[PDB]
Design an enzyme around this catalytic site. Structure first.
Site, mmCIF file in Angstrom:
data_model
loop_
_atom_site.group_PDB
_atom_site.id
_atom_site.type_symbol
_atom_site.label_atom_id
_atom_site.label_comp_id
_atom_site.label_asym_id
_atom_site.label_seq_id
_atom_site.Cartn_x
_atom_site.Cartn_y
_atom_site.Cartn_z
ATOM 1 N N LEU A 36 0.791 -1.229 0.000
ATOM 2 C CA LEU A 36 0.000 0.000 0.000
ATOM 3 C C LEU A 36 0.831 1.292 0.000
ATOM 4 O O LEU A 36 0.371 2.329 -0.493
ATOM 5 C CB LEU A 36 -1.005 -0.010 1.158
ATOM 6 C CG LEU A 36 -2.141 -1.035 1.054
ATOM 7 C CD1 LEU A 36 -2.933 -1.129 2.364
ATOM 8 C CD2 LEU A 36 -3.067 -0.728 -0.125
ATOM 9 N N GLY A 37 2.045 1.230 0.548
ATOM 10 C CA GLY A 37 2.930 2.388 0.567
ATOM 11 C C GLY A 37 4.332 2.121 1.096
ATOM 12 O O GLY A 37 4.634 1.022 1.570
ATOM 13 N N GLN A 38 5.191 3.133 0.997
ATOM 14 C CA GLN A 38 6.522 3.100 1.597
ATOM 15 C C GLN A 38 6.741 4.402 2.351
ATOM 16 O O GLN A 38 5.821 5.223 2.475
ATOM 17 C CB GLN A 38 7.611 2.923 0.538
ATOM 18 C CG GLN A 38 7.623 1.562 -0.138
ATOM 19 C CD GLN A 38 8.898 0.801 0.139
ATOM 20 O OE1 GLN A 38 9.253 -0.130 -0.587
ATOM 21 N NE2 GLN A 38 9.599 1.194 1.199
ATOM 22 N N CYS B 183 10.086 6.750 4.862
ATOM 23 C CA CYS B 183 11.446 6.796 5.393
ATOM 24 C C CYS B 183 11.474 5.953 6.664
ATOM 25 O O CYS B 183 12.408 6.029 7.469
ATOM 26 C CB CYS B 183 11.877 8.239 5.673
ATOM 27 S SG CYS B 183 10.726 9.200 6.697
ATOM 28 N N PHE B 184 10.429 5.137 6.817
ATOM 29 C CA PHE B 184 10.222 4.287 7.990
ATOM 30 C C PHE B 184 10.130 2.820 7.568
ATOM 31 O O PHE B 184 10.746 1.938 8.175
ATOM 32 C CB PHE B 184 8.923 4.681 8.726
ATOM 33 C CG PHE B 184 8.192 5.868 8.117
ATOM 34 C CD1 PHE B 184 7.154 5.677 7.210
ATOM 35 C CD2 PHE B 184 8.528 7.173 8.474
ATOM 36 C CE1 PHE B 184 6.479 6.768 6.653
ATOM 37 C CE2 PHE B 184 7.857 8.267 7.923
ATOM 38 C CZ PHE B 184 6.833 8.065 7.012
ATOM 39 N N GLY B 185 9.349 2.570 6.522
ATOM 40 C CA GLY B 185 9.067 1.219 6.088
ATOM 41 C C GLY B 185 7.918 1.231 5.103
ATOM 42 O O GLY B 185 7.942 1.994 4.132
ATOM 43 N N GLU B 186 6.904 0.406 5.354
ATOM 44 C CA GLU B 186 5.812 0.230 4.398
ATOM 45 C C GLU B 186 4.436 0.210 5.048
ATOM 46 O O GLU B 186 4.312 0.332 6.267
ATOM 47 C CB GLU B 186 5.997 -1.079 3.626
ATOM 48 C CG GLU B 186 6.952 -0.978 2.462
ATOM 49 C CD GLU B 186 7.722 -2.259 2.231
ATOM 50 O OE1 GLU B 186 7.114 -3.250 1.767
ATOM 51 O OE2 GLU B 186 8.938 -2.270 2.521
ATOM 52 N N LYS C 26 1.728 -1.523 9.322
ATOM 53 C CA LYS C 26 2.826 -0.580 9.159
ATOM 54 C C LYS C 26 4.116 -1.345 9.425
ATOM 55 O O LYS C 26 4.286 -1.938 10.487
ATOM 56 C CB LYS C 26 2.706 0.594 10.126
ATOM 57 C CG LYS C 26 3.439 1.844 9.648
ATOM 58 C CD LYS C 26 3.523 2.921 10.718
ATOM 59 C CE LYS C 26 4.101 4.205 10.126
ATOM 60 N NZ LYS C 26 4.612 5.155 11.160
ATOM 61 N N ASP D 204 0.733 15.524 15.317
ATOM 62 C CA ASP D 204 0.766 15.505 13.852
ATOM 63 C C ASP D 204 -0.620 15.308 13.237
ATOM 64 O O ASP D 204 -0.886 14.344 12.506
ATOM 65 C CB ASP D 204 1.744 14.450 13.338
ATOM 66 C CG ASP D 204 2.066 14.629 11.861
ATOM 67 O OD1 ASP D 204 1.799 15.731 11.305
ATOM 68 O OD2 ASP D 204 2.592 13.669 11.258
HETATM 69 C C1 LIG Z 1 -0.676 0.140 10.934
HETATM 70 O O1 LIG Z 1 -0.006 1.348 11.121
HETATM 71 C C2 LIG Z 1 -0.491 2.471 10.498
HETATM 72 C C3 LIG Z 1 -1.093 2.308 9.141
HETATM 73 C C4 LIG Z 1 -1.646 3.509 8.425
HETATM 74 N N1 LIG Z 1 -2.233 3.303 7.110
HETATM 75 C C5 LIG Z 1 -3.453 2.482 6.922
HETATM 76 C C6 LIG Z 1 -4.237 1.807 8.046
HETATM 77 C C7 LIG Z 1 -3.950 2.090 9.489
HETATM 78 N N2 LIG Z 1 -3.732 2.297 10.585
HETATM 79 C C8 LIG Z 1 -5.468 1.013 7.721
HETATM 80 N N3 LIG Z 1 -5.950 0.853 6.388
HETATM 81 C C9 LIG Z 1 -5.267 1.462 5.280
HETATM 82 C C10 LIG Z 1 -5.796 1.284 3.869
HETATM 83 C C11 LIG Z 1 -5.073 1.919 2.721
HETATM 84 O O2 LIG Z 1 -5.595 1.734 1.434
HETATM 85 C C12 LIG Z 1 -6.707 0.892 1.272
HETATM 86 C C13 LIG Z 1 -7.557 1.420 0.118
HETATM 87 C C14 LIG Z 1 -6.749 2.444 -0.668
HETATM 88 N N4 LIG Z 1 -7.554 2.913 -1.851
HETATM 89 C C15 LIG Z 1 -7.844 4.331 -2.111
HETATM 90 C C16 LIG Z 1 -8.275 4.534 -3.580
HETATM 91 N N5 LIG Z 1 -9.344 3.627 -3.940
HETATM 92 C C17 LIG Z 1 -10.118 3.985 -5.125
HETATM 93 C C18 LIG Z 1 -8.997 2.260 -3.665
HETATM 94 C C19 LIG Z 1 -8.695 2.096 -2.205
HETATM 95 C C20 LIG Z 1 -3.840 2.733 2.958
HETATM 96 O O3 LIG Z 1 -3.146 3.331 1.935
HETATM 97 C C21 LIG Z 1 -1.836 3.711 2.199
HETATM 98 C C22 LIG Z 1 -3.298 2.925 4.341
HETATM 99 C C23 LIG Z 1 -4.008 2.288 5.504
HETATM 100 C C24 LIG Z 1 -1.576 4.869 9.083
HETATM 101 CL CL1 LIG Z 1 -2.173 6.322 8.341
HETATM 102 C C25 LIG Z 1 -0.968 5.013 10.434
HETATM 103 C C26 LIG Z 1 -0.427 3.829 11.147
HETATM 104 CL CL2 LIG Z 1 0.262 4.072 12.715
#
Ligand SMILES: COc1cc(Nc2c(C#N)cnc3cc(OCCCN4CCN(C)CC4)c(OC)cc23)c(Cl)cc1Cl
EC number: 2.7.10.2
Length: 266
Positions: free
Chosen positions: A17-19, A21-24, A39, A130
Site C-alpha cells: 500500500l505504501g513506503q 522513510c520508515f518502512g511500508e 505498518k 501531527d
Molecule cells: C498500521 O499502522 C499504520 C497504518 C496507516 N495506514 C493504513 C491503516 C492504518 N492504521 C489502515 N488501512 C489502510 C488502507 C489503505 O488503502 C486501502 C484502500 C486504498 N484505496 C484508495 C483509492 N481507492 C479507489 C482504492 C482504495 C492505505 O493506503 C496507504 C493505508 C491504511 C496509518 Cl495512516 C498510520 C499507522 Cl500508525
C-alpha cells in the site's frame, strides 16, 4: 513482552500500500480470517521503541474514531498490526474521484468525527503532535478515524499544520493539535488543497507570527471560517476545546447555519 504481541507466522503480508522513510504499509490477513493493515519496518530502517512507542500510545488509546491497534511484532521481522481502513487517507480521499461530489454536510460531518476522536484524546490527556488530513483514514459510509500518533505523548515537523509555539519552541499541547484541526478544516473545505497556497515554510512561519491567517475558503460559510480563526488564536489557551468543536460541528446545520443551501462546490 506483553499481551499485544503475536506470532508473525499469523500474518499474511499480501498487497502493498505504501513506503516511507520508515518502512511500508500492506493489506494483509491475520490468523486467516481477519483483514488487517500493517505498518512495517523493512528490516533495519529505524530505532526499536521509536517505531515501537506509537504502540505504547495506541495501546492505551481506544476510541471508535481512532484507528484501532490489533497487535504488534518484535519477533523481527517487525510489524505494527491495525484495523483496516477501506478508502485510505482522507487526503487521497478528498483529492480523488469522490472528492468533488463531497458537499459541506458531508465535510462537516467528517470534521465532526475527527473532532470526536480528538476530544477523547483530549480527555485522556494525550497530544497527537501531527494532526492533518494525511493522518486521517476513511472507511465505509464516510467514516473517518485519527491515525498515526507516531510522535504522540502524555503532556508531561511539517510546519504548515504546526502551531507556532510548537514549531518554534517545541511546546506541544492539545491546544497545538487544535491549531492543526483548524488547518485540517481548510483541507476539508478545499478538498485536499495544500494550506497557505504559494507560500514556503519559512514565509508561513514569518507571516503567521505577524498574524496572517488563511481567509475564508470559497463557498465556505463565515461561521465556519470564524471557527478556524478561533483554532488559530495566538494564545494556545484561548483556542477552543475539541469538545466544543465536536458539539459545534455535529449541531452545525441546525444551530449555526440552519439556512445553508448547496452551491457548485460546497
Ligand atoms: C498500521 O499502522 C499504520 C497504518 C496507516 N495506514 C493504513 C491503516 C492504518 N492504521 C489502515 N488501512 C489502510 C488502507 C489503505 O488503502 C486501502 C484502500 C486504498 N484505496 C484508495 C483509492 N481507492 C479507489 C482504492 C482504495 C492505505 O493506503 C496507504 C493505508 C491504511 C496509518 Cl495512516 C498510520 C499507522 Cl500508525
Amino acid at each position: 513482552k506483553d499481551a499485544w504481541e503475536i506470532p508473525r507466522e499469523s500474518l499474511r503480508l499480501e498487497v502493498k500500500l505504501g513506503q516511507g522513510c520508515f518502512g511500508e504499509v500492506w493489506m494483509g490477513t491475520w490468523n486467516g480470517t481477519t483483514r488487517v493493515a500493517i505498518k512495517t519496518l523493512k528490516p533495519g530502517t529505524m530505532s526499536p521503541e521509536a517505531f515501537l512507542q506509537e504502540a505504547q500510545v495506541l495501546k492505551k488509546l481506544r476510541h471508535e474514531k481512532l484507528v484501532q491497534l490489533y497487535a504488534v511484532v518484535s519477533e523481527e521481522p517487525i510489524y505494527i498490526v491495525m484495523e483496516y481502513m477501506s478508502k485510505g487517507s482522507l487526503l487521497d480521499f478528498l483529492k480523488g474521484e469522490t472528492g468533488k461530489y463531497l458537499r459541506l454536510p458531508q465535510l462537516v460531518d467528517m470534521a465532526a468525527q475527527i473532532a470526536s476522536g480528538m476530544a477523547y484524546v483530549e480527555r485522556m490527556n494525550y497530544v497527537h503532535r501531527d494532526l492533518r488530513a494525511a493522518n486521517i483514514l476513511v472507511g465505509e459510509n464516510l467514516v473517518c478515524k485519527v491515525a498515526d500518533f507516531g510522535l504522540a505523548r502524555l503532556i508531561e515537523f511539517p510546519i504548515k499544520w504546526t502551531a507556532p509555539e510548537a514549531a518554534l519552541y517545541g511546546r506541544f499541547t492539545i491546544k497545538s493539535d487544535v491549531w492543526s484541526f483548524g488547518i485540517l478544516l481548510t483541507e476539508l473545505t478545499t478538498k485536499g488543497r495544500v494550506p497557505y497556497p504559494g507560500m514556503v515554510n519559512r514565509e508561513v512561519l514569518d507571516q503567521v507570527e505577524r498574524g496572517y491567517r488563511m481567509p475564508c475558503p470559497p463557498e465556505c460559510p463565515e461561521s465556519l471560517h470564524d471557527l478556524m480563526c478561533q483554532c488559530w488564536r495566538k494564545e494556545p489557551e484561548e483556542r477552543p476545546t475539541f469538545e466544543y468543536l465536536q458539539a459545534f460541528l455535529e449541531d452545525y446545520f441546525t444551530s449555526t447555519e440552519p439556512q445553508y443551501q448547496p452551491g457548485e462546490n460546497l
